[PDB]
Structure formats: structure tokens, C-alpha cells
């Protein structure tokens, strides 16, 4: 069980840790989050009480270093930092724990939600989508644009998701125009899986990361990438059976976790109607079709 201490909380803020959230008052004696499960990535995220715009946060893995949060009054945000002195860090955490100044990661024993949402998500892949090589953790916010959104403006602040474009020479073999447009199996299996991602685990990791950035930060380009990666599988007639079964599990937990009140902005009607009712895979996503029909029958 690892710990992310906070130096202090000088401004009133709603703090998220994965799917959980806590309100902290201005100058409340709050000194961090303990009992964080080892084995998963995590995200610690912020929404200020005085400006509920710019949700922002940090992806990290406590196996990769000792991380803490400290408010910067110049840049006006909570920043993640790495403590390189192990003994200073252990001494800070032990003191804050003894004074019970830390919230406990509130995981129910039965509850695999976080594992199910991050099964394929690896910190090393996050650090290639979010490029800031001097840190072992990754900053994301509501406003960051994707490489694809930028092509259609600060490159160093971009989300480098894999570009997917159904009307591109990458997607369409000369001489197989109708075939490749109506059946995206060559684009999925040869270009994306064999070519770029190398395996289905890396593809699913990026799909899961995109979803979580959409949900936690309202990051619109992330939502676009999540839907594009769903549509590319559902629009392929030839998909390995293990990938279809895994996608149904992935999407079921994403739809299960989504706040009911955000379905209007986070779910694309066209993609979901096409994927569940028209696509090659309309009959391959039983779990996802059942939770979507019971939770969001209006969208469909």
C-alpha cells in the first residue's frame, strides 16, 4: 500500500483519486492519500471550488517513485513532484499517518472496478501519449488537444493518441477502396494491431486511457479517440474472438462507471447505435448491449 502525501491544501478543491472524490476546504489540515493499491496505474485529479473549469490531474504508478502533491501559488495549481530522498519521504509519510491527516483509498474488497477500467493501461504507454520525459508521472487536463485535433496548436502539450482516420490512405489500400471502407479488418488487423500497436493489449490500453481522460477531465479529444477505437473494431468483419470478448468486458465496465448525468456529452449516439445495432459486431457485445439498453435507452 503506497502513499501520496500533500504538503498542504491552501485552496478549496475537490480531489479525485481514481473513481473516488473528496472535498477539501481552504487551509484544511489535509496531508494526502494512503493505502493506494500497488499493481495499477492511478490518477489524482483536481477541480478548484472557485474555478470549476480546468479539471486537471496526474497519472502515476507508486512502483516508479515516491510522489507528492504541493500547491504552487504562482501557477495556481496542485503539482505532482517526485521526492528522490527515500528517508525524508518515509519520515514525512510516517508523521502524517501518525497524526491521521490522510484519507484512505476507499476500496471495497469485492470491488474490481479500478482493475477492470485499467487492465491494459501501463505507465510506460501513458508516458508516450503524454510526452514530459523528465517526470515519471503524466499531467492531463480538460483543455489539452490531441495530435489529430491539432492537424485539422502547442505540440509539447498534446495528447499523442494513435491517429485513426477512416478516409485516409493509411486506412484504404489502392484497389480495395469499397472493400476496406465497408470492412475495416485490414486497417484494424494489419495496419493498427500488427503494425503500430504490436498486440491487442496495447490497443486496449490506449482505448482505456482515452476513456478515463474523457470521463475524469471532460477531455473532448480523448472522447473522440475512445469512440474511434471502438468503431474501428465494430466496423471490422474479422476480429479475433478473444478481442471481441475482451472488448465487451472493457466497455461494460466503462458504461457501468460513467456518471448517469454525463451520458449526453460523453456518449456519441451515431457510434453506439452503429456499433450495437448495424456493425459486423452488433451481436458480439452482449454485456455492453444489455447495460447500455438498461442505463441509456434514450441515446439508442
Amino acid at each position: 500500500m503506497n502513499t501520496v502525501p500533500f504538503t498542504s491544501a491552501p485552496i478549496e478543491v475537490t480531489i479525485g483519486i481514481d473513481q473516488y472524490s473528496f472535498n477539501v476546504k481552504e487551509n484544511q489540515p489535509f496531508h494526502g492519500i494512503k493505502d493506494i493499491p500497488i499493481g495499477h496505474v492511478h490518477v489524482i485529479h483536481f477541480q478548484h471550488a472557485d474555478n470549476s473549469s480546468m479539471r486537471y490531474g496526474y497519472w502515476f504508478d507508486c512502483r516508479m517513485g515516491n510522489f507528492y502533491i504541493q500547491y504552487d501559488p504562482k501557477d495556481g495549481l496542485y503539482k505532482m513532484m517526485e521526492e528522490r530522498d527515500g528517508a525524508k519521504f518515509e519520515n514525512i509519510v510516517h508523521n502524517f499517518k501518525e497524526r491521521q491527516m490522510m484519507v484512505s483509498y476507499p476500496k471495497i474488497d469485492e470491488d474490481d472496478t479500478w482493475y477492470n477500467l485499467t487492465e491494459f493501461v501501463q505507465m510506460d504507454k501513458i508516458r508516450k501519449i503524454v510526452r514530459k520525459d523528465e517526470n515519471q508521472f503524466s499531467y492531463v487536463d480538460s483543455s489539452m488537444t490531441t495530435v489529430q485535433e491539432n492537424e485539422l496548436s502547442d505540440p509539447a502539450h498534446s495528447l499523442n493518441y494513435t491517429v485513426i482516420n477512416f478516409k485516409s490512405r493509411e486506412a484504404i489500400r489502392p484497389g480495395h477502396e469499397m472493400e476496406d471502407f465497408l470492412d475495416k479488418s485490414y486497417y484494424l488487423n494489419t495496419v493498427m494491431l500488427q503494425g503500430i500497436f504490436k498486440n491487442s493489449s496495447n490497443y486496449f490500453g490506449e482505448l482505456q486511457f482515452a476513456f478515463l481522460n474523457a470521463m475524469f477531465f471532460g477531455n473532448y479529444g480523448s472522447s473522440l479517440q475512445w469512440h474511434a477505437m471502438i468503431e474501428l473494431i465494430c466496423s471490422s468483419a474479422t476480429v479475433p474472438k478473444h478481442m471481441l470478448d475482451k472488448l465487451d468486458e472493457i466497455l461494460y465496465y466503462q458504461i457501468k462507471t460513467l456518471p448517469e448525468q454525463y451520458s449526453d456529452i460523453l456518449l456519441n449516439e451515431r457510434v453506439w447505435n452503429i456499433c450495437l445495432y448495424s456493425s459486423f459486431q452488433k451481436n458480439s457485445l452482449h454485456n455492453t448491449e444489455k447495460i447500455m439498453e438498461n442505463k441509456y435507452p434514450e441515446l439508442l
Binding site: 478516409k167 485516409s168 490512405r169 484504404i172 477502396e177 469499397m178 471502407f181 465497408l182
Partner: protein
Amino acid sequence: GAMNSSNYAELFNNDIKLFVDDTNVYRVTVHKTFEGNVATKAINGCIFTLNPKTGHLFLKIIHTSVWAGQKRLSQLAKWKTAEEVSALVRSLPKEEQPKQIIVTRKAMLDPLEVHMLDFPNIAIRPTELRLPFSAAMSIDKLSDVVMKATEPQMVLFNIYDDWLDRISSYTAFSRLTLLLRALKTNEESAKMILLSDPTITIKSYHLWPSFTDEQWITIESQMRDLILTEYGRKYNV
């Protein structure tokens, strides 16, 4: 974006552009089988590809052999159209290639865009205009070359005959759309109007009769009367 009544003069500027009409690509007769089921029999079709400034018509004849053993023919017909338009563009010298292709039916946009990926600077546009190019097969010489074809063939025409010697491309296009709208609304009546006077003939090298400027005014009036009559019937107004 979309070509409409607002941006109509753009058709006659000096930017090369083509209209593509796929209406007559996949043509069938529907009939009963011996067992009393229904079946289709394909007949030869054509792509109607028109430069509205010059009148140059690229009539690609679609021979029934291209459908043999294929499924979902109304879908395939759009892709085959886009394949043949792409092949036509690639066959033209660079200085003759269009800067825009206007499709008469929105269902042609994705097929044509995908086949033209190699030409990112050629704009593929829809139109809000309701153009009567489906009636091309009411022009006897066009219908005759399509029906006689025994293999895929491209035939080149000038759909304006020699009109551009006397009138602008705006006026020529308006005359063509009026003739085709009349032929579409009441083919028998339109053809009667065009051949009623036996002294006015069609030149071997032309599609339409050799009307004088005054005869064209009389003809155009007769076509407008035909269209309004028919309209009052369609809607009881």
C-alpha cells in the same frame, strides 16, 4: 460546401469542374419468374459526367457484365461510379483535371472521396440543386450508344452542340436543364415539341435540333408550358 441557387454562377467560372450523376449506372427491369417470384434483369447503364462550362460530356457506358456474380448491386454501383470517375481524372492531363467534382446524389460523396484520396486538392461537393440529369437517357443518341454497347466503353459528346457559338455557358446550362426537366416530366410531349416541325433536323454530329435563335425561344416557351401543366396535375393546383 454544397452547390445551391446562392453560388450558381460558380458553375461558369474558369475553375474546371465536373457534375457526376450516377442515377443511370444500375438499371433494371423488374419481372415475374416462372414460379411467380420477382426477379430483376440488368440493362446497360451509364455515368453522366458533365463539364457545365464547356458542355463536354464523358459518358461512361456501364455494361451489364460488370454486375455478373456481384451482390448488393445498388451499393456497388456507387463505388463503380467513383472508381470510373477516379480513372477518368487520372486519364486527363494535369491541366485538364477538375478542381471540383459536384455529385448530384449525396450517397456518392463517401465513395468518390475514398477513390480520390490521391487528389486531396480536388474538392468533392454535394448540391442542393435538383438537377434532371436522370433524363439523359431520353436523349435518343445517348440512349442508342448505351443500349448498343457490347462491352465497357467511354463516349465523348458536347451536350450543348454548337450553342456556345451564340450563347453563354450560363444560358446553355439553363436551356439544357429546361430540356431535361421537360423530358423527365413528360417525355412523349417533350419529344413531340422537339421534332414537331420536320424541316428542323438534328445534325449527324449533334444531339438536339438545329433551331434558330427565334425557334429556341418558341421551343423553350413550349417546354416551360409543358412543365407547369404537368405540375398542376401532379398537385391538383
